[PDB]
Symmetry: D2
Subunit: 522 residues, 4 copies
Amino acid sequence: LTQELGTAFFQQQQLPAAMADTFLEHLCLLDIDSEPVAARSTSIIATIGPASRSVERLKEMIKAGMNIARLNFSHGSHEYHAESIANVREAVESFSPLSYRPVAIALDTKGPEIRTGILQSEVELVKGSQVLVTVDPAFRTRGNANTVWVDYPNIVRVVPVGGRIYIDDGLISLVVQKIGPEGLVTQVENGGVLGSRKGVNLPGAQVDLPGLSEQDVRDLRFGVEHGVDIVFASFVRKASDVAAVRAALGPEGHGIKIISKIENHEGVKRFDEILEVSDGIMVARGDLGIEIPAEKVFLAQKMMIGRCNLAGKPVVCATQMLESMITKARPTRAETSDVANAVLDGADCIMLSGETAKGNFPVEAVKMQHAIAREAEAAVYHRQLFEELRRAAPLSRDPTEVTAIGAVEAAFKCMAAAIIVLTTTGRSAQLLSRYRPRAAVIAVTRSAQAARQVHLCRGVFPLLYREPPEAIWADDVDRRVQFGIESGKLRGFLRVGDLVIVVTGWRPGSGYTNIMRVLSIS
Amino acid sequence: QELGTAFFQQQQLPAAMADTFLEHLCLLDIDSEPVAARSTSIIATIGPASRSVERLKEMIKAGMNIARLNFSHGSHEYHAESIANVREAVESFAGSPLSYRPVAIALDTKGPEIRTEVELVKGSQVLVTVDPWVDYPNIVRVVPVGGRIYIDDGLISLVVQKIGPEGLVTQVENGGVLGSRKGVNLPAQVDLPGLSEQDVRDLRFGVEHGVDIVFASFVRKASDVAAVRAALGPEGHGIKIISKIENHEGVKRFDEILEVSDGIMVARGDLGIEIPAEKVFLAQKMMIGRCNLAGKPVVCATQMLESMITKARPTRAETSDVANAVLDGADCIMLSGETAKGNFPVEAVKMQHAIAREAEAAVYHRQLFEELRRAAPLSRDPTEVTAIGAVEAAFKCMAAAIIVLTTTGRSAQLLSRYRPRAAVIAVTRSAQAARQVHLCRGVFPLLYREPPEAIWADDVDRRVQFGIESGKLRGFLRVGDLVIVVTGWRPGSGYTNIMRVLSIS
Amino acid sequence: QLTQELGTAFFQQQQLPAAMADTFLEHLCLLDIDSEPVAARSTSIIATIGPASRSVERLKEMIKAGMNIARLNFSHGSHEYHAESIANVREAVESFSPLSYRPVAIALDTKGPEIREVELVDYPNIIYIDDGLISLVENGGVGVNLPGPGLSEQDVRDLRFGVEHGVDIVFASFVRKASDVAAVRAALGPEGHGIKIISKIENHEGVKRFDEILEVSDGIMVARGDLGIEIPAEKVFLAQKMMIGRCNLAGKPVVCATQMLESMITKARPTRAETSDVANAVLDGADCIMLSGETAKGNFPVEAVKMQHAIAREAEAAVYHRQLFEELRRAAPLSRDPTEVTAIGAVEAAFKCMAAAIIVLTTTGRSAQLLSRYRPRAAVIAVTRSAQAARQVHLCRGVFPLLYREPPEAIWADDVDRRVQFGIESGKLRGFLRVGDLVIVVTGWRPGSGYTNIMRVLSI
Amino acid sequence: ELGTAFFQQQQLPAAMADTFLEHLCLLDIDSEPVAARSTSIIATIGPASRSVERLKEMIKAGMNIARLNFSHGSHEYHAESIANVREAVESFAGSPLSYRPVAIALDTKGPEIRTESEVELVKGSVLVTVDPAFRGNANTVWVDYPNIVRVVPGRIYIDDGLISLVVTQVENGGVLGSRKGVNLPGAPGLSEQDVRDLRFGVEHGVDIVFASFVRKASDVAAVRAALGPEGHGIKIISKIENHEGVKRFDEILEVSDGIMVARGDLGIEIPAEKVFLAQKMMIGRCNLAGKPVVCATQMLESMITKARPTRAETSDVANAVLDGADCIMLSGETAKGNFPVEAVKMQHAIAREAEAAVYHRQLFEELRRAAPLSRDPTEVTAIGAVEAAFKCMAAAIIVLTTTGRSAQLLSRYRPRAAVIAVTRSAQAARQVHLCRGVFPLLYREPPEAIWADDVDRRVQFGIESGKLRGFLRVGDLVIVVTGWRPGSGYTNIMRVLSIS
Ligand SMILES: O=P(O)(O)OC[C@H]1O[C@](O)(COP(=O)(O)O)[C@@H](O)[C@@H]1O
Ligand SMILES: O=P(O)(O)OC[C@H]1O[C@](O)(COP(=O)(O)O)[C@@H](O)[C@@H]1O
Ligand SMILES: O=P(O)(O)OC[C@H]1O[C@](O)(COP(=O)(O)O)[C@@H](O)[C@@H]1O
Ligand SMILES: [Mn+2]
């Protein structure tokens, strides 16, 4: 034993469960009185909307743990989103270099959306009643309790008699009874309050929408123009869908990370080819749980998180994680469970939508995800996870890859408080994070954009280094390492007496990481 | 491999053969359809939405296995009617002995409940008084300054500022809109009796009405379980006691509670107010793990498909929660408001059924069996020895079922504790044992109604054949399947000691 | 734990503390020289017959010391010589209650393509000599091997002689390929179809074509002597461990052979390397271990047999069943064969309750063999009416054959029961079983081989 | 991954196996060893191996440690053996890049009891007498242990336990020679003689002491005291040779630098068939503790008179390596036999094959688990370096070390990569031979003015010596382990380098 740290120390952070010999025994030893210690490592994405646009609200959200701001281009004009970007940047800047928190900005594309029209504000579609789905432009604004208009003309051709049409998060359901010149005549399977311009899903259908629409292209170029850090690409179904996105971003947008949203059957089945050309993945559960049966989504989520973990690429879990918090101050027991299990599954990021975009408790929702993620991360059975990742990852002659596993192994040996890594592009930090160390990965960089983008990786804490280079390079390295230490002390990551692992390289420029050193904090 | 090319793509079998848990997850396939019968039992709570005989018939057909009676509300007369209705619905299917589904009835006690539309402003001062306000006098004694009072599923909170003869004077920590007769939680030293006067009458009622199970509220320690068992008396010796773990003490004193209980319920509603909400998953996963290890039923409860009270489809987190409770190892999953009072009680049961079926197929048996087998203690008890032997055998040949004759359910429970992929088909003459075994994942009770053969060995064979016949009718078994048959060497319970490998003809 | 009521002394024996360790390394760290073996020795001992062990009286002492299989080395001696050896073994075996009768197998070891006092400073189609001592580089010093023919005429004649005298096993010398095994099976003829064929792997080609050879063989011998000349001596252990592993996986007997206790040819006690070599052969997973010169011509034949027995017993207790069972289990394929399914259920069950034995009824040995392959700690007590199957199952580790002599009862179920009781009484007398023990009993649903499908848990 | 041929060698196909059983099944006689032989070879000095000419051939054959058996020979005899070893070793010092440090170990006589007509003891029929007037016949046995009468009353073993007695009757008879070893299983510390032998050892700069019949921790403290202040840097290897040593193993290992499984005596003191249990146990616990362990006695016994070993002897050598022995030893085979050099070459050939057959996947996982957390930077750097070496199939781990300790901490994890240890301490270079897979390079140049330059220069020496010896080739990856300041105990850096 080691009374160097204290008896108390080994009772915290689920350490008694960490040393179990089987997963089952690990579960049996989890302890509600064992308090988390490590800094929360899972990234929190918060969607911007009326409830979170204010600069003052955004500062509270950043303080609560928001790492990435999501702009939902399904709604709002370019000017609206420009203002969103503006407020985030002002919140971020209006807080010492040692305490600065970068926040990334992600553009979530509209994609192949089918939507109903504006009624003549709320109507009801009685169960059993008959409703006409029309593409007749005359009925564009003539929507009512028996007549639904949709903005997808070819719908009348892709939905056969008997086919189903979902409206508003798949809540309203219609089954096609008769196809005619006027449109699909259907019977309301499940009724409800239909509003204006609601989402439509055609599960079985062979939808013929572009994939990257003319609008999407304009939105993406807007993103490049305003320096967004990440793009969440909607309805990615194949490698060529990601190429389209890359192309639309152009020469100037080559540094933007592409996270492919998997939202339908084809995307799940062509996952491998998609992950191969993407920077990361979003499990987009909203559309996915309508496009495939709701009861199969967890299988897709667990499979996708697993393959991303193997590949060392960021994966996001999204949609309805704390839904009830849109109107209530506390989440349901299923929602807390869902956040915790997403972390335990292996997610790099978890996301909030309505909860922060439009609900009454946006800051509370961020705080709740932070509290859950922190408990969950301590409950991860590193013994099994590290060993399985280690044995699956392939032999490597890349010195950055070799140094990373050595560093994470070393960290586990001494209960390192942190691994401090210098990085130009984020990569050295990324290859560390993929082994899921318990130690915080403190990444020191001069690239403001890499500092934002690295928030996609679990357990990476970016520090933006602002000072001009020293005349002597080895001196410049050492100074950044010290910046990382002093930042970590300030933020409560590090204490005098802690051991850290320090990861650097042998020459300037990206790609030369090759050194690990074991340092005591003084 | 042999005799099935399409067979090995289904039921997540490609993932089943994975060499590591990570590779197993990576191999899960949305196109791999479940084959096995759904094995996790579904508990539905009876209420206005699910109390009529016609609605109960639809719920039985949708998959409900246990009917829960919530004694926090309703008179004895009301509950007697609920029970009569469940029994009427259940026996409406009795005409088909081969296709008949036993349904258990569980009485969920009221327990030590404390109760109280105007809005409580935050920062303001509210007056808590037991002067004819909460229905619990000693509240003004068990709360020290700066201690916390939760009201209304923990949505509203208060801290004590002044302790006076007019009551407890408190400010509003978390404000909200109050209401009437709303639940109060005090996370601290409540003296409220382990078992109230009302609780004792309710348990007597349960016994007089032949309930199969008691869910005991707020079990804190072994002695609370003994009090329930005393209250049930000699007439109720056969009733299973499931201890509800709902607060910090219960979680801490879990082992002693488990040792004297028949099983456990993770009562996440109160638990999530009594301890911080973000810790409940830790308690859930730990309690399920320990129950699996001990071979005792564990129930996951509360708010699993909450939004289906008003919506036709659940949220993404709700489906995830159900699937993960099954993957955690829960024997049963539960529905409350979703069936008691909601607009979609039958749809709620059907959704749990569909999710559980998918989740069950995703279980990584290779690791689970190895870990349960190893952690379990050597035993010279023939029923335990036979069970592990039978489960090993079923795994070896991908048996369609293990058919077991049981008087008390015990031989079936012992099979269940190892999580076979094979369905455990339990043939019994005991109506009550047939109902109670629903507490065990993957046990499918068949009630045998024929009087004994003169020759005991012939009577055993008839019952095994009954097992096979119902199995075929229900789609558990088909010609060319292998089954494991578990029996005993003499009549009477406790003598199970034989397993046989049979081909279905 | 709870079963501590079976004794605190009980769980300190047969390396049980090492048994429950969670890693192999921890298992080694817990091996304990004061933890005494309990189970009957399970690895079979094969003793070569020669001038030191022809005596009926000597053979009786050897059977008593633990010899299970008598090996006739047809590399030397006329047919009449071997017929006399066979005669003596049989008379020793028979001149001993049916409850204690120990069957002894007889194996014929073929001569093979052999090639045969100065101080060097018969194959016409014509370089090591004398056990590879002299070569070749060039190691002049005081039997020839050419690392760079087939089923001889003599071999064919010997094999026919083997069938005439009802030998139980053939060890086929220098098997290099599947067709070599077919030639042996041919020479044995219709009348020899029941004789077990153990292929001797003795050169490079045989090691390289191991898989196809094992597929058509009943088992394998690691013939160290020629092997260690045909390939570099320092590579033999690799061949041995590989072949033993694959036979284990396949569930077919494998024999380790050759200089296992060599020094005991002239000395009363073996060397430290020798005791180590025997224990490691058992730990590797060998079904049988063999003695050659040690029993054929040496001065301490009975002592050699006793020494292998003593070492084997200690080493079997030291097997890390946790890992072995798991690995065999995970490696063996799903099976719809009821005997296979029953066998794994019985061994699991035996492990659950620390069964004293698994008692199995068998006609051909098969049911006992499929139990054997999972390497249970419990003794496999196999009851058979076939005297030949009773001898042949000595090839399988952990199988104790009992030869049942009574004619069948009128009611088959009764005859089954009677044989099960025969197993129990035999096991009691021999000290396998004690009142209060649990045994696993494995039987079948109809008479005749191939219908094993039942496992029962019984207390004595 | 360059070359399908590369992955056929060094039992790599078996290395990748998912279970131990499958690893065994994949072992391949055609898969040639690549790595340098890593298990250390101890040869005993005797008439067959004493001359400078023979010792040179022995060094070339692979002897790493010369053992001096103080059970026989005078101080003058052993001083000559030491001088001879040193002359032979320094005959190669002219090539700093390819020179092989050889350790000298003193093996104490210990509490030995001894008894050329050669009479015969007939079974069933003997007088065990200490009457000092006997110089012994077919019924008369005199022993140099006066207290024998009081202590035994009970079996008495003579001559490597070949003869036994139970005044006594013969239980196991045989020919009895002159002055034979006597064993008394089931009940004097350090000899006045042992004390002089140890003082002699220190005065002659021996590197290691093999202490005979260590029964408990105090026996080791006694050796340490006898070595005194000038002998503080000498490694103490405790010989476990009887029942009490085995039962008190843990307390002995705690205070020892290492262990020898002395199978000769152990095989007489406890039943012969139990020794393998003692061996595998002791090796496991030493591997666990990260301390060297030696397997000894009769490993290639027949080679005393034969040019080639038996099949059991080769198996014994290979299994000792597979068990986890850091060192293997030859006694009579080199001290007095006809083929001392051939014995050394044979252990080298076998060890090399066995090392390739080690299932690192499981071994590294198990050693890593069972090992305790450490906040010692040398221990933390070592596991990170070994993990990194495994990740890239590094050809070597080059480590700078003053005392050998940083190299030892690398060795305890059993890397496949050779541990090339560069040191200025001649004695540390000899002493690291006790650790499997450490290859000591003695660096002889005076310190650079600038310490960082001196460090770099020594790493380069490491690389150049490595290329000459065949450890390293252009395009290989190496892990370099160094420290942040001069002096022992400051190792804290690992670097991944390409060999140009
Ligand atoms: O993670 P990346 O992008 O590969 O960058 C790591 C690089 O950072 C460094 O530590 C220092 O680089 P700079 O001085 O150019 O910022 C290099 O040694 C190393 O190659
Ligand atoms: O699981 P339980 O309750 O112990 O009952 C198992 C019992 O069932 C039997 O198979 C048949 O018993 P009955 O004929 O008395 O119903 C017995 O052989 C065995 O002891
Ligand atoms: O293994 P040891 O005995 O602790 O020696 C390692 C030492 O060698 C060094 O690498 C160099 O030390 P020197 O320059 O003093 O030889 C140190 O940085 C380190 O502390
Ligand atoms: Mn979507």
